Design a protein around this ligand. Structure first.
Ligand SMILES: [Ca+2]
Lengths: 555, 555, 555
């Protein structure tokens, strides 16, 4: 009859409007589950999906503070359009102005307090460091808040959450594998991380990705990983993602011990992603603790095997953009890392903080960072690394004495930009492979090729090759000049060719009687002045190496 | 009974084959709506979706000239697989050859006329400027055509159109917010823009994106925005998109006044996108009118607050590719802009047209543009900007006198390429932070480090440091030479070291009696020729600064 | 009654659990088809979908060796979540260690043999070349295996396969157009290519894409094309894709003749993609055969029209990353190509192999490749090409005499990195457009600007401009030195300014009687030593060009 036919020809879906609880709907479901009414959940409410492969389509809100916990979803299950919202409207800070300047003054930040589920974030203890003095100034009702509405996927394999959004919203994958957060539809975050893959118990996380989408706000980091290892296959990480205004960092791999084990991460991808206006860092890809580090690594490689900041993290890191960080645009540690195509621009905080060793950085741009001067540098590298291509300086000036690059053990090539050379500190800087060269000078009456020996002086050029106009701009004539520093006066001693279009070489001479050791090489002469006879003499080192003094020019 | 059970266990969807009109189907719908028969609509036909959150799945065509208007869709509604097609087959031009060379001659373009819904576009008034003389030569039936089949989403929030396609097809989001055009499946455009977010009435547009996908053809721009502001969160714009053969521009933010208000745009993202073969521009990210601009900005910041081309547009612009533009590959205006990782190559038109001020450009490549010589330059910058990394010149030659870069108020570093230095015009050019250098010469008997003072001459080097082979290639010997220009003859005066492997310095002398003012510095001497005695003399400036003339070399 | 109402209000879907065969379910389907039980298929089993536009949702496996063939799907059909798995568990090799070093020794590779559907690949004949001697050492049961479970879409238009996965899995689009493989969910490959668009019969393939997703393993290439042409619109190719551990190459356009016709490809996009750890190549974008090429091109342009490797392939190639290739990171051929933003790093094999002609390469980075020294170079270019921006050398050393870049007909600008200049071979190298320059020296007592004439010597600098510290580091004094090579001894002859802070120029003289031809220019003098009188003489070329010998300095 009809019922036999109908059962064969129609798509199966249950809808939440037909059930008193979410578990009742889950139990009834076979293929589809439609969330077609707002659902108020209690923190810790747990739904058992019976191992079923379900296509969950959300067209309403899950409303609650705390965690709505999904369990026992079958591999291939998908959850689309989820919207999490807290019941509580907390107090939030908004540490930026109507012209999008960061507020750094604690009292100014306190003045921004409002009750809202968005457009700011709940203070946490990290704000006490970020805005010194704010701990004392914040009213009690703005401290210690803990509002998040979290969808928790617990101990599932092969589950994807697509187009998720919300207000004071979080997404937690706890003990999951081969799960993805795809095309996040700009959830506005709460107290906890917005997207978290946490694998502190069970097998190391693997196959876990953030792909596409974006998030805004949140008190802490937007996308974060604990105890994930993508394997040599690099099966996990963050690709195609945007984070705006993280209360901590945009993308974070955790460092150090959490609970009783390692929170660290290996072999993940961080590519094609953007972090804008994080309160702390753009990308924080470190694994070992920075300040006050642990002396051990329970559940990970021991310090005896790999010293602090020298783990073989092996992440695949490429094509990242940060703008507007208040902390550090791009931070990492590790040994033997390859990093490419990183652009950090227009940051109040520093551009890069790299606790790396035997690592290679290719095509890095650090442009107008440390704009507030809270840090000692714009890019720092601790260990012995190679930088191949480094763009420095946009349009911002720097007032004080802070370095631009401090990479004292690194070998660097390919700096471009209007960098102040006194603010470069590297182990070695070289352009070994340039072709024939031309120095083109605009807005000056001369062109210059200068030399600076940083061991002698970081602030003064030690010699130069100049070309200078003779006469007016239409003269068709210039003089070439070779100079050397003396008494810390650049260009103090020089030889000239064609000064005043004279077609001759002007040769400097020793202004008094030359000592024997003033001459360096054999078969050379050094002119010197004999004032008592109004004569030039020549100190000559003969071809055989012996010295003789001759008369060179006389009245 | 069964009907109670069936109502609970089956997915709800209505299909258009069961209804005489689209409104009848819309009214019946609860969850799904399937378009399973072709639907002929009349221009302006308007469907009211009752605030319902609908999943609209299209497996057939909407056929009609003019606009099919969708209204009152609930937040979270999705429309997938839509296919728009005109009833009319218009006359189109195809201004490119079978070898994909652009046709620029009006008569050649007229000769391409055919009736088709694709593989070309309907002429509009901008073609009269693009192909001078074409207005007179086009037959009347090819002028003033207005064929588009447009899906209009009107005054909706949170609606996504996914995998849309069509023929003579357009997509209009009018007065919408938080709407997206996702993975456009290469619709072939009509007369109007292919994808438009227009917010001239109501609140400024926000949350509106083109994400992924591609388009082809169209008479005007492929993706365009009017009166959208993404906020500091940068919630809107174009990410991951490809435009082919736009009749105007690939991606356009409108400029100036439209109707009675501003059409301008702020705080949008333009990233990870590609524009190929636009008739006009690749990316046109300007906000103020170029030619014959308005004297005011109704509905926007007044000219008194921000002068023309100096709006704080604040777009996030990164990782863009243009190839094959007939107009300008990359155009913008604004003040305080940051722009990075832009590649423009193989363009008949110019590469970049930048009416920007106090802006920063990082890692720009402009490669083989202005190949037809319709423009004065390959990259132009009007205002006082910084360029950090600029690649110029691929393999194409330039015949005439056009500049490569004309950026007269800009400070530039990091030019690479076989640029003709006479075709560089900047305020300042500098490599402040190079390491130890080597000039490697291939295919010559010498290596060179040249100096050019553009104030003196843009075409002639003013001095040089050379190394030149002595003897044959296996000699193990070279001479080093320091030269200076005189009488507009490069290398006219020089000093040599080791010419003919002689192990000595060849020193130029003044060819006649040296004037007092020919010598520059104290404790120096200048040799000069006394022909009447066959002697070298020395003009000596003593250590005390006084002059004396001495005999230097005699018979 | 109810049945009339039910037929109108419910979504149509059939499910495989209600049918004995896949064809029975296909025949019954109208809108949806759900794969809700594992289905064992026989090789060549063919399903006719009746031209219907079906949404096929897979929540179970297709299990079988050989091909499951889908035919007569309507335009707009979609297949999601498909999982292919072989019945056979073959023998696989795993030629890498637990520290992810490549195994190159045949006996070591044989020792890795295990029976598994993943974590390795079935040997094919290309392994006999890749691991010399392995053909003899492999047991017979590991040779000639042919296990793949392949979903074949045959002669369909407008079909998309989304989120596909599997074990020993392949995906074949045979004679298709406007089809896409979207967001591949890391299928683990078998013997055949993982994703193939093959159009050897019928019209040239067009509209065929791999978009997003990733694959792992496989015996041969991950994504590959035969006889596709995207048109000027560039409607096809690979965008946003990742390949891990291809048994051959990550992304491959086929070369030469297959069957009786061309397998070549034109006008495709290769962008925003990543290939890691391929056994052969990252990207192989060649069209003509490398070793032992055909003398003809049946079905393509004849050799008389375009010589070997000089086809107008016209692909759009941009923003590619390769790491860990054992073969070549990036290979191509063709004439008139534009290529940009390619990064190849940390490869055992060479970085780039470019059989290109009149082509332009912009912003290329080749970093730590040829690390095993199996190849003669890190980047090779055969023809007359332009390279604008080339980063060379990360942190790896090279022991032997292999070149870094061998591009003997190419003109290059913008090399950065710690390249050994003796390992650069180009037609011309030049930095024509640098600004005012500073050479900053760190870790030395001197700074240097060196010149090297490769025709004279590739290994020895021919001259230099130095600045050297006088005294200790706090002296405030340096000497400038201009040097020239003699007798293959760099810096053999020099002029100094300010040696020992003497404020004078030390001038080299000819150590014996100067021959007439030692002097070059008129109005110059050359000092020389007359030992028989303990005198300096001057060989003078007078302003009139005649020679005279004068006494310069005397006892
Ligand atoms: Ca004398």
């Amino acid at each position: 009859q009809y019922s036999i036919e109908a059962d064969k020809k129609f798509k199966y879906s249950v809808k939440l409007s037909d059930y008193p609880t979410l578990q009742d709907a889950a139990s009834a479901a076979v293929d589809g589950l439609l969330i077609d009414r707002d659902y108020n959940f209690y923190g810790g409410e747990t739904v058992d999906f019976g191992g079923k492969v379900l296509t969950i389509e959300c067209k309403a809100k899950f409303i609650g503070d705390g965690n709505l916990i999904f369990t026992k979803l079958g591999k291939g299950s998908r959850i689309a359009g989820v919207f999490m919202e807290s019941t509580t409207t907390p107090w939030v800070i908004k540490p930026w102005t109507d012209d999008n300047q960061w507020l750094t003054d604690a009292a100014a930040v306190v003045a921004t307090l409002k009750q809202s589920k968005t457009d700011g974030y709940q203070p946490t203890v990290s704000d006490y460091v970020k805005f010194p003095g704010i701990e004392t100034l914040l009213p009690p009702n703005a401290k210690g808040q803990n509002i998040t509405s979290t969808l928790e996927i617990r101990e599932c394999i092969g589950v994807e959450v697509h187009r998720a959004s919300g207000l004071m919203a979080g997404f937690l994958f706890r003990g999951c594998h081969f799960c993805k957060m795809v095309d996040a539809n700009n959830p506005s975050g709460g107290k906890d991380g917005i997207i978290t893959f946490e694998n502190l118990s069970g097998d190391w996380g693997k196959g876990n990705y953030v792909i596409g989408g974006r998030t805004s706000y949140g008190s802490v980091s937007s996308a974060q990983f604990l105890r994930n290892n993508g394997g040599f296959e690099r099966d996990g990480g963050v690709i195609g993602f945007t984070s705006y205004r993280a209360g901590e960092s945009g993308v974070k791999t955790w460092q150090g011990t959490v609970g009783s084990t390692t929170s660290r991460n290996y072999n993940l991808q961080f590519r094609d992603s953007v972090v804008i206006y994080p309160v702390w860092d753009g990308f924080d890809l470190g694994a070992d603790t920075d300040m006050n580090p642990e002396l051990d690594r329970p559940g990970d490689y021991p310090i005896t095997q790999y010293p602090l900041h020298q783990l073989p993290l092996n992440h695949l890191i490429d094509n990242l953009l940060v703008r507007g960080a208040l902390g550090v645009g791009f931070g990492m540690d590790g040994k033997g890392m390859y990093v490419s195509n990183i652009t950090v621009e227009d940051c109040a905080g520093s551009g890069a903080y790299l606790l790396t060793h035997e690592s290679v950085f290719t095509n890095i741009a650090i442009i107008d960072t440390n704009t507030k001067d809270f840090q000692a540098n714009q890019i720092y590298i601790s260990g012995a690394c190679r930088v191949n291509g480094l763009r420095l300086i946009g349009i911002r000036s720097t007032d004080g004495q802070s370095l631009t690059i401090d990479a004292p053990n690194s070998t660097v090539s390919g700096i471009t930009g209007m960098v102040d050379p006194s603010r470069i500190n590297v182990a070695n800087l070289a352009e070994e492979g340039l072709g024939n060269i031309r120095a083109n000078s605009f807005g000056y009456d001369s062109a210059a090729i200068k030399l600076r020996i940083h061991k002698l002086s970081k602030t003064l050029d030690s010699g130069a090759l100049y070309s200078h106009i003779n006469g007016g701009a239409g003269s068709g004539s210039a003089y070439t000049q070779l100079t050397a520093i003396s008494g810390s006066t650049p260009d103090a001693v020089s030889l000239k060719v064609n000064h005043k279009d004279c077609r001759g070489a002007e040769i400097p001479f020793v202004p008094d009687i030359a000592s024997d050791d003033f001459i360096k090489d054999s078969s050379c002469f050094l002119p010197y002045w004999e004032n008592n006879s109004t004569s030039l003499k020549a100190l000559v080192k003969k071809p055989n190496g012996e010295l003789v003094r001759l008369t060179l020019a006389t009245l």
